[model samples]
Target chain A: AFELPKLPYAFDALEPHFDKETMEIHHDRHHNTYVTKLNAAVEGTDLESKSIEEIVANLDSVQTAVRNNGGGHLNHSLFWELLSPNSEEKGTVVEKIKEQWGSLEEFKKEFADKAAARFGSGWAWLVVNNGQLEIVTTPNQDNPLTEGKTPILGLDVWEHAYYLKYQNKRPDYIGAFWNVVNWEKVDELYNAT
Target chain B: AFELPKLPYAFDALEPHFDKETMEIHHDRHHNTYVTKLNAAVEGTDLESKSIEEIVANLVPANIQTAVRNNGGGHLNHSLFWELLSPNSEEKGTVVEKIKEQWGSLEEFKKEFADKAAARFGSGWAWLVVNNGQLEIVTTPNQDNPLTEGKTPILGLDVWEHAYYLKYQNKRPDYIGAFWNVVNWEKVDELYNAT
Candidate 1:
């Protein structure tokens, strides 16, 4: 059985920035539903043996159910791991931000624009493609990894991610998301490359 | 200033079928943002004098196209959505007769409508549109209304996650099913015959 994993952080941990209700429902209700539904979509098929990421990368042949549910499951799982209550702003990633986008403020602007540019339920990513940092967006639950880019940092622009705390102010939510980002996690992801 | 109007029904009026919290937030928070932003986008332009329907009808200007498409459409869609939704009773009015004449029955129409909603992969709406003098089911991505697609929307079901995520977490079909219970059939009939 593809059981739902417990959230890494308490529901209230990211309060005022992310909000407790979104966390409680997003994890307790949303992600659990994806995992359970994902299992049903791939079960007894050849895809059952493949890991969640595997199902996502080789997405050409799978049913839309597998793609949507598995993509949501993987995206949300990685999403949780990337967030923290608070993180250091100055890290190796900060230097790389300057190298890539000139400065942290500029890097933030670029990231925000890409995130805000996404119109539907989707994610915005800071990715490494061919040894250079670039920004991209995928509609719905898709990610840079599915399209052959390795993501170092990503933001979920789905209304559920911020509507409870920020309402229709998605840009404002993106601004506050800077507070709880785990830069060390992003640094490690970049270093792994 | 483009302002948000009050819902025709009390927030709790659509209870059990549509929750008060969702209605409160969807209208108060979400629709307000669209109205505020649409006003900003057209603050000093010719678009200010035009109606919301007009802005959506002629969404030109490559620079502000996305802005108008998003904000202006959001306002139009939600404004229409609130009226077409209700806690009132309904029946096989003129709209049902016309739809039945087109589709086999109301069940078939709902199936087609819900199917379109289910097929929509992201934040969007499922619509009953008047196109080419025929009633058709259509889905538009990301706040796009049927108006931009050269059709008139008589009824729309917002399949956006924010529309049903609170009550029906990934079970979009169930939410679509409940839409029948709350739909203002007489208004739908009126819109159809008037056009």
Candidate 2:
């Protein structure tokens, strides 16, 4: 299993909007648990030799432990890289999102709704499917990439992601997310194709 | 507003097996959130006069069904969950014999329950129910109870991360295994007989 990916910034980097305690626990406690369990699940298996992407894409062939912990490890990795306090949705990232959904605000309204409307623990994403951005959600550690969809922006809606700070108020956490967009990293994801 | 109900035993009653932190958080925080929300969801509505069990039993009206299913189910599940566990118990009882009668051995029955509980992919519950005159192991997504229809749940294990995340973290199987140590088999026997 891949090691727990480090947060791109210090624990306190996204404070106020995202508290330091929740950030530490989300990465150190929550994300780190995924990384740790994934290692144990795949340590001596055929899946061990594959990259995280391969492991997630072949999820149907993998055991539930691998599918869950593997996807968890990879999803949190992308989520970490997607957060930055000093970035914005500028450049083509903005224009493409606008062209597809009218404006960033409209895109985010759909994004927030998808995040909040999810009935259980899961995630919401703005992913590229067939070269167009679309909003999607998946349950229980799944990501669009598991089904070969390209994820550009991902938001973890699992209660553990926001319970310490926001508790049942997930919408407030979604609101806070806009302020900490690692748009540069997202822009890179957008240009990856 | 619905208040947190009193636990049957002291907070430390199920320590070592279940742990104080998990019990406190699962009940005071998690279960309490449901009751408070359930009250908010039904307050001033016709559903308010009905009990939590009544609201869940009559799941309908689309909006009421959504609120009650999640929150009412939480309230009912946790209250029964508390009743189903205890720190003190005899080693073997009517329920123990019944387990052997159903599944060959107590260990086998435990493993059977653990299997259902361990396999629950998301927030859910593992149940040992009386279904159509036979004992069966079943799992429900989220707070859904056997009382919803067609069965009587005599015992259940909460598999929600909030149930054990503090101590066991992601090791849901470990939590499932530990639960066997503290199960109030006597309570289960009474429930079984009643059903």
Candidate 3:
């Protein structure tokens, strides 16, 4: 069964970008709920033996509970890993992003644009699709994995993730997200992929 | 072009249930954006002359259909939603009688409605709708109206985060519980009779 992962740092570690109260609730409550539901959904099933990534990618055979909660578990787990109080713009992934989108600034602009344009609750992703970096958005706890893409970086656009700090200014939240990105870990994922 | 509707009551009239700040932002920014985008989407097109209900019912042209589905539904849903909320309204109408008749009691009906509202995993609305003259509990994702499925919504509960995140946070059931306190039962009855 799937279990919730602990944050690498304290709840307040990403403060001024992502607030402590929001982090505490988001991780302890929201993410915890997803993990609990996901575990229950896959309990006593063959899915309990499968990994989170495998479960999400091969969702055709699972119930909606598994699809929604499983994706939530996987998405949030990666989300926490990619956020850091200190981020440096030096990575192979950064170089590749520059190559594909012309510049890191241009790539960030496109990513934020897609994040803003996603009409409802969802995520914006930097995904490896067919050996190239592509920006994509998924609706409501869905992951790019379901569509056979490899997600290296993800930005959660769900209102719950930032409502406490940003309110209706999702663009501001998107801007603030840049300040806390874990480019180091992102590069590790890109290299491994 | 679609237009935004004003709330019948003051922004703070439903205080202690729905907060003033949330109502202001939800109506002014969120609902207003939908109307603006809905107008922009259909401007200078054949859809310009069609009614919101018409555009929703007969969505064509796949390219712009999504804008209409989202913004048009947002415009229409919020328009009806404003008319369905009032701290002063009471439950003394045909809709209340019909609800009791169908579900045995108002409490029972609210239980079913709130269940559907809480169960919605993302942004959506839970509805008490009339389909073939029979009442049903229905839910639609991301501004989708029940009309698309041949149902007439008399009562609806918005499960969208913007609707309650300010005051309720992740406690959606608490927000759903607070909804009954401010529902405009008068308008619900009027809609029921007209339907």
Candidate 4:
């Protein structure tokens, strides 16, 4: 059985900004559904035992089932883990954000700008491209990994991700995302990559 | 100055599903910025005076500004798009389902719809339109609307690379699949009633 990943905090933990109801639905109904569907899609296939990362890495070889559901599962899984409501207030990848991008604020500005500028449904990422950190936006569900970059952080700018709460105001959603960021996870990726 | 429209629902209203950071940035930074840039593109121009419908109709006209047509038009289209959706999936458009009734079941309708959306060459839309109250699925190339052809668009899905590239990444169909979960059927029903 596909299991719902436990959130780091309670549904109402991110209160005043992200409410419990949307979290419940987004996680339980949306994210969990992706995993379940992914499992169903891969159950009878040889690709079932492959890790999500391995499947994503071999996007060209995977059949439609592995490609779509695998991608959905991987993307949403990473997305869920990337967030945290903790008030720890730690910043971005220190060396990359400070040294490479000049300052964390500049990095934030550029990252936010790219996220806002993404034409339609897409994501903005702070990626380690060829050993240098860069901010880039991918159209639709394309991730940095597909384009040969190591993504340290990702932001989903899709309308469905924020439309109900933000309405037509995507920038607000982008701006407010900084508050709940899980910088620790980003740091871990930074260390690994 | 273009200002961000405050959300119709409270910040935490969509709780348990979407985090606060996602909503706040999506609205204040993302959507508001689109409005600002759109306004800047239209400032001191005849395009500013034209309604969104009129602008969309003339999008491909030789005399129109590309920046205004592409960016301004994109902004207008997305603004409507944001409002047209709801966290309440039940509230989405029903005309498409109604069309499904005419064509077959929702499943068949989705198959055709998904096929058209997946096959669209590039940056465009797959729309369910009403031409004299008859529902039809049609594709528009790059910001062009069914309204240009004298049809009323009841519901539309943006298939531009930017729409799903980040999450689904070259798999438009998967993005289209999740789209159903968030579709606002009620808005479609209202459009149908209005028409």
Candidate 2: CAPRI quality band: acceptable
Question: How do these models rank on DockQ, best leading?
Answer: 3, 1, 2, 4
Query: Candidate 1: what is its chain A TM-score?
Result: 0.93
Clashing pairs in 1: none
Q: Which regions of candidate 3 fall more than 4 Å away from where they truly are?
A: A61-63
10 residues in a row with least lDDT, candidate 3 chain A: A58-67
* Residue B38 miss distance in model 4 (angstroms): 4.6
lDDT of 2 by residue, B2-113 (tens): 5668899988898888878668777777888888888888778887776666666666568677778888888888988999998984548776787799899988988888
Q: What are the chain B TM-scores of all models?
A: 0.96, 0.92, 0.97, 0.77
Which stretches of candidate 2 lie above 4 Å from their native place? Answer: A1-70, A85-117, A127-136, A144-150, A160-180, B1-4, B43-51, B54-59
Q: After superposing candidate 4, which stretches have Cα over 4 Å from the reference?
A: A1-4, A60-68, A87-92, B1-39, B42-136, B139-195
Please name the candidate that would achieve the greatest TM-score relative to the true structure.
Answer: 3
**For residues B13-123, could you state the per-residue lDDT of candidate 4 as single tens digits?**
544443455456555654566567667776777767776777766663354465556655565556556555567777324675576578887878778889988766536
**lDDT, model 2, position A129:** 88
lDDT of 3 by residue, B83-131 (tens): 9999785767788888899999999999999989998988889998888
Q: In model 3, what is the error at residue A160, expressed in angstroms? A: 0.5
lDDT of 2 by residue, A23-131 (tens): 8877887778778888888877888678897788776622378878887888888988989878676876778888988888998899999898776678899888889
Q: Write the per-residue lDDT of candidate 1 for residues A119-162, one digit (tens) a residue.
A: 77999888889778898988887767777778888888888887
Worst 10 residues of 1 chain A by lDDT: A54-63
- Structural similarity to truth (TM-score) of each candidate: 0.84, 0.75, 0.97, 0.61
Q: Write the per-residue lDDT of candidate 4 for residues A90-138, one digit (tens) a residue.
A: 6557655787867778888888888976765567888887778888886
Instruction: Flag regions of model 1 displaced more than 4 Å.
Output: A1-6, A10-12, A36-63, A101-106, B1-3, B43-51, B166-174
Which tens-of-lDDT digit does each residue in B6-29 have in candidate 1? 899999898889878889989998
Q: What is the lDDT of residue A24 in candidate 3?
A: 91
